[PDB]
């Protein structure tokens, strides 16, 4: 019938972990026959499919591992250790600490508002700071047919450039080479993250 191999190490139940670190819970037990171990989160069955990242289970070592913890991992985790003769259990309470994110913050290139001659090169610069992963786009206001706006809220725009930043700080650039009359107009650096959107406008006249 099941028992803890070190019952004294089983007194501690509360764990706080900063986000993106790894948590391991153990319930080292013994019995004859050697018992089963299964894991519950908030009293329900707990499976890899219940978090993104999955779980790593290690029955011989009586362990549940969760890599890269996030706030949604907060809660109660119970091991149920069982053979035919009996049952024991242990519940851990996990807190996960993470800073709250903000909307992106943009900074324009000091030239922006510009003028240039036919055939010359123009470059717009946009510094994007974002504590949550941003989608960064350079856009251009177009005109489908006298539509410097659209039957809605909604200036018409096409997307010149797009990427997802891998870092909190990005220096994003738009290069307009060998400029023609065509290239004159209003340009936007836009940055969107989970929390929201920021943008700056840049003008060219050729």
């Amino acid at each position, epitope marked *: 019938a099941p028992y803890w191999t070190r019952p004294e190490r089983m007194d501690k139940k509360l764990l706080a972990v*900063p986000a993106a*670190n790894t948590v391991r819970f153990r319930c080292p037990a013994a019995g004859n026959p050697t018992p089963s171990i299964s894991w519950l989160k908030n009293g329900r069955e707990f499976r890899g499919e219940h978090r993104i990242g999955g779980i790593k289970l290690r029955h011989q070592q009586w362990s549940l591992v969760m890599e890269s913890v996030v706030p949604s991992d907060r809660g109660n985790y119970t091991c149920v250790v069982e053979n035919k003769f009996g049952s024991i259990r242990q519940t851990y309470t996990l807190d996960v600490l993470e*800073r709250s994110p903000h909307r992106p913050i943009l900074q324009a290139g000091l030239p922006a508002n510009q003028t240039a001659v036919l055939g010359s090169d123009v470059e717009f610069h946009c510094k994007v*700071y974002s504590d949550a992963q941003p989608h960064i786009q350079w856009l251009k206001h177009v005109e489908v047919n006298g539509s410097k706006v659209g039957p809605d809220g909604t200036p018409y725009v096409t997307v010149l450039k797009s990427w997802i930043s891998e870092s*909190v700080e990005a220096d994003v650039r738009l290069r307009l080479a060998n400029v023609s009359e065509r290239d004159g107009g209003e340009y936007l650096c836009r940055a969107t993250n989970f929390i929201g959107v920021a943008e700056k406008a840049f003008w060219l006249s050729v």
Partner: antibody
Framework: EVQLVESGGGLVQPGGSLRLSCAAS????????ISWVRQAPGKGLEWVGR????????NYADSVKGRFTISADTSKNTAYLQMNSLRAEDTAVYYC????????????????????WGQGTLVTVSS | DIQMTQSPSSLSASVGDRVTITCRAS??????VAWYQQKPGKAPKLLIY???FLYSGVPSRFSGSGSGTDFTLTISSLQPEDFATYYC?????????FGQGTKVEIKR
């Protein structure tokens, strides 16, 4: 995949100073740490120190204590190694590594894991 | 400090072979042992943490075992991309310390 890029390596005279930088990608810089480890030419790996988390406390190898300092700018996701009073034997490739901890109430330690390492920067100490 | 002693320092093997590398701690380090792969001119890459836990995305032919003072890394069936140097490391205490490396080279 976290990517790290080390910079600032080069030639410096014995007794001199050098600051390395380690720029990290990603959005979890503040809740994890950065370790520095070096590799002398043709040799093995030697841990230099750790800042954990990046807004937290530091630890150093005995061979480096009082001479090297680790810091970080959380607004830049950049960690630094300030190297003073350099010696010929500090000659090495210097790596920075993203470091996280394994938290576990059953044991009295937190295992630190260095999972993503930069490409390295070469520091040569010579006259 | 805690000293980690790796054996062998080198070995020659063929694609398909089972390879076993050992690492011995000078004192008990529980299971706080990691394994790294390094290729010439490149940074080390993490394979295994907590003695036996495979880092995500690492092939399952790699495995680790051990507790206390004796640890082993096994490659079940060696692949062309596996010829490299392998390092153990303990992080039971500070400072964390590395073994001296095992170079796995190609038999011909």
């Amino acid at each position: 995949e976290v990517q790290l890029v080390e910079s600032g390596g080069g030639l410096v005279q014995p007794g001199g100073s050098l600051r390395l930088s380690c720029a990290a990608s990603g959005f979890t810089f503040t809740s994890t740490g950065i370790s520095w480890v070096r590799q002398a030419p043709g040799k093995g790996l030697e841990w230099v120190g750790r800042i954990y988390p990046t807004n937290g406390s530091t630890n150093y190898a005995d061979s480096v204590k009082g001479r090297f300092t680790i810091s970080a700018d959380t607004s830049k996701n950049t960690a630094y190694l300030q190297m003073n009073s350099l010696r010929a034997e500090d000659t090495a490739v210097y790596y920075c590594a993203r470091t996280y901890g394994i938290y576990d109430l059953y044991v009295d330690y937190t295992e630190y894991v260095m999972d993503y390492w930069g490409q390295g920067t070469l520091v040569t100490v010579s006259s | 400090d805690i000293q980690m002693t790796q054996s062998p320092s080198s070995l020659s093997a063929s694609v398909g072979d089972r390879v076993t590398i050992t690492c011995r701690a000078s004192q008990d380090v529980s299971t706080a042992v990691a394994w790294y792969q390094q290729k010439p001119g490149k940074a080390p890459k993490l394979l295994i943490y907590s003695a036996s836990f495979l880092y995500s995305g690492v092939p399952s032919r790699f495995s680790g075992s051990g507790s206390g003072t004796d640890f082993t890394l096994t490659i079940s069936s060696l692949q062309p991309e596996d010829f490299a140097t392998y390092y153990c490391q303990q992080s039971y205490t500070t400072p964390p310390t590395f073994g001296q490396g095992t170079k796995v080279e190609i038999k011909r």
